[PDB]
Design a protein around this nucleic acid. Structure first.
Ligand code: MG
Ligand code: MG
Ligand code: MG
Ligand code: MG
Ligand code: MG
Ligand code: MG
Ligand code: MG
Ligand code: MG
Ligand code: MG
Ligand code: MG
Ligand code: MG
Ligand code: MG
Ligand code: MG
Ligand code: MG
Ligand code: MG
Ligand code: MG
Ligand code: MG
Ligand code: MG
Ligand code: MG
Ligand code: MG
Ligand code: MG
Ligand code: MG
Lengths: 90, 54, 62, 70, 117, 102
RNA sequence: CUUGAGUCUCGUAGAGGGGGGUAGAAUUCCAGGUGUAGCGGUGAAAUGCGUAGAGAUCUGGAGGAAUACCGGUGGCGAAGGCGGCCCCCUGGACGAAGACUGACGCUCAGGUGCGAAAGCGUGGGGAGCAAACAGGAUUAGAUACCCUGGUAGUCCACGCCGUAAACGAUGUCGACUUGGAGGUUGUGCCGGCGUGGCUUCCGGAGCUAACGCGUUAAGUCGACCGCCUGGGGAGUAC
């Protein structure tokens, strides 16, 4: 009810977190510490081998990971996290 | 003729082709998560290209 | 939810209604915003009333 | 889907914003849809198919975890 | 002749063709090209490549005038719905602004019947 | 008799005439043993979209409790008066008094 | 006599019906400005539109029809059906405590009324769409599918017609008989625990030729009605 309205808090694309994953998909993972709030980070990201990476492979459930916010969709209510960025730039 | 082609590459191109032809993800014939990743990987790349085709 | 014990969502509450539309003025579906059934129906009537009075838009292309 | 370009923003960051602008406004879907008139019976019969599918997409996420391969 | 500086580029991306026209910011046409005029016919006419040519060969139809700014304004679902926005970049304009103006009825009139084949 | 709620907007250039209009209407209302429960006045606001190529309008909220014929006269009055560029007449279940979010 | 049936009191939700207003998007047209050689269409083409300046783009005006998003295996109606917003008239359902009537009930041949779309009559209206019709293609042929146009009609008023795979292919009313997950709408007592209505999916016993149905029964019974009796000939002839 409350949290989505004042989502300025971590709005800036540059902002980064450490959140904890809930479950995996095969297109992402979802990393949800913010509580009542949850990102995704798509399988495109998480690696520098594009999709040559199953989410299960790089990360597993109940596992904390550093991530930047990239895109918040105020309405439609969906945040786009990035995991390949908060670690190396080879 | 003497040796089977790369299974991962084939799986990635089968994915692409179901993609362009517009089948649903969840037609994917693989449960081997390794091949599965290739299949969907193709299928999603293909979803982009359909748009700019007629 | 608009379930701070509200009787009848109001159209002139422009501050609130803006949270339930998008950039292009389209009403956002209940499943996205977690709105209950009968608060969504009020939310619809209000935004429609508003649009008449020009307190809110129909589009961006105008 | 009206993106203004930001200070020093690369063109190939505006463009991808613009694409994602109308992906989330679902334009081509709307246009694709209204190319031709669908009889109101056909539209409504589509709506059932969507429902009887969505439903069975709240079944695999249960039942698979019960069964087992090899 | 009378230089401008600030323009706008309308793009009409149909399934069969792509018309592109630069105009002053009161919408007065200055130049234009198509895929049909670019030298493509039928199968070819309806591609993102043929649309690209159009955009850049429309860019060197408006050299006469000033240049720098250009707000793009795209309409329709054709394949020419980006290859142009790309081409205008390497044509050497700066795109300040860019927007879909594809018309949608809020109901409107009955569409044609569906094609049996 | 029965509650309403008017919310008439009026041509900007002719805002000077609005205090008169409010004066007049609230006469007719109560001149049939009616009432006024609210009467805010929002004043030259910005229109979300144009109206006859205007980009502003002077808004005037107003509640009532009247019988039908006067609230009817009032609507016709708005029709022909051409400084009044939009109207609106909802019914409401009760009297409404508390000041508006505007 | 009060348990069936009904009346009153306070509220709730709703595209239920009738009448009258009005608002934004869009298409087509008409009148201007800019501008110049193509537009349109298809699997590929052509008919068609365009130097008498189209298409594209901007401004002004006219007119009709339908109401994006909300929107959901959501809601309302006896069924057919019902979707922008606002007032006027109007029907039904549901719940909470109370009071009131006292079997006033259920079903119903004949009868009476409502009844999608097309169609018909009179008078309007006509944007878009589109039977007929005309031209272009395809094909051995193509009175088709596909393309370009396009008249009835589709819209409004009043009056007819009485039909549909008018379907849950399942008549109406009442009683009884293990469960599970939802949706929508009331109301109790403490965001947990109850108690009503309507509804979606799944399944047990039972039933079924099987498919399946399964407390919204196609299970177990009672009341009344409708209907069937090999296929063609025929829902046709008189
Ligand atoms: Mg067509
Ligand atoms: Mg105009
Ligand atoms: Mg007695
Ligand atoms: Mg009878
Ligand atoms: Mg009869
Ligand atoms: Mg008819
Ligand atoms: Mg005839
Ligand atoms: Mg007639
Ligand atoms: Mg006539
Ligand atoms: Mg036509
Ligand atoms: Mg035709
Ligand atoms: Mg012919
Ligand atoms: Mg009528
Ligand atoms: Mg009639
Ligand atoms: Mg019959
Ligand atoms: Mg029958
Ligand atoms: Mg029964
Ligand atoms: Mg069952
Ligand atoms: Mg039975
Ligand atoms: Mg049987
Ligand atoms: Mg027979
Ligand atoms: Mg006969």
């Amino acid at each position: 009810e409350d949290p989505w309205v004042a989502i300025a808090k971590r709005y800036p694309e540059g902002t980064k977190l450490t959140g904890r994953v809930t479950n995996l998909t095969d297109y992402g993972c979802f990393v949800e510490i913010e509580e009542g709030v949850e990102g995704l980070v798509h399988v495109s990201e998480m690696d520098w081998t594009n999709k040559n990476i199953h989410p299960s492979k790089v990360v597993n459930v109940g596992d904390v990971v550093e991530v930047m916010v990239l895109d918040i969709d105020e309405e439609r209510r969906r945040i786009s996290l990035g995991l390949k960025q908060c670690k190396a730039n080879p | 003729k003497r040796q089977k082609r790369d299974r991962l590459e084939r799986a990635h191109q089968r994915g692409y082709q179901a993609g362009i032809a517009g089948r649903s993800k969840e037609m994917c014939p693989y449960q081997t998560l390794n091949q599965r990743s290739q299949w969907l990987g193709g299928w999603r790349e293909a979803m982009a290209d359909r748009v700019v085709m007629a | 939810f608009t379930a701070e014990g509200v009787q009848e969502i109001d159209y002139k509450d422009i501050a609130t209604l803006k949270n339930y539309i998008t950039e292009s003025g389209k009403i956002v579906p209940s499943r996205i915003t977690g709105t209950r059934a009968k608060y969504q129906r009020q939310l619809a009537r209000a935004i429609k009333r508003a649009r008449y009075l020009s307190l809110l838009p129909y589009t961006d292309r105008h | 889907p009206v993106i203004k370009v930001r200070e020093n923003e690369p063109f190939d960051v505006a463009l991808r914003r613009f694409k994602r602008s109308c992906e989330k406004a679902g334009v081509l879907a709307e246009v694709r849809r209204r190319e031709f008139y669908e009889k109101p019976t056909t539209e409504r019969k589509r709506a059932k198919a969507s429902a009887v599918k969505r439903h069975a997409k709240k079944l695999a996420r249960e039942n698979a975890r019960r069964t087992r391969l090899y | 002749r009378k230089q401008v500086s600030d323009g706008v580029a309308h793009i009409h991306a149909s399934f069969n063709n792509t018309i592109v026209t630069i105009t002053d910011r009161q919408g007065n046409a200055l130049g234009w090209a198509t895929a049909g005029g670019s030298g493509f016919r039928g199968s070819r006419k309806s591609t993102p490549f043929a649309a690209q040519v159009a955009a850049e060969r429309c860019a060197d139809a408006v050299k006469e005038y000033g240049i720098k700014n250009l707000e793009v304004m795209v309409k329709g679902p054709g394949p020419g719905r980006e290859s142009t926005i790309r081409a205008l970049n390497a044509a050497g304009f700066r795109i300040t602004n860019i927007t879909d103006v594809t018309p949608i009825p809020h109901x409107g009139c009955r569409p044609p019947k569906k094609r049996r084949v | 008799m029965r509650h309403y709620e008017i919310v008439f907007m009026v041509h900007p250039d002719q805002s000077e005439q609005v205090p008169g209009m409010i004066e007049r209407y609230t006469a007719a209302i109560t001149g049939a043993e009616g009432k006024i429960h609210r009467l805010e006045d929002w004043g030259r606001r910005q229109l979300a979209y144009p109206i006859n190529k205007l980009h502003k309008a002077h808004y005037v909220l107003m509640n009532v409790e009247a019988p039908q014929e006067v609230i009817d006269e009032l609507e016709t009055t708005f029709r022909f008066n051409d400084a009044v560029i939009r109207s609106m007449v909802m019914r409401t279940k009760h009297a409404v008094t508390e000041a508006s979010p505007m």
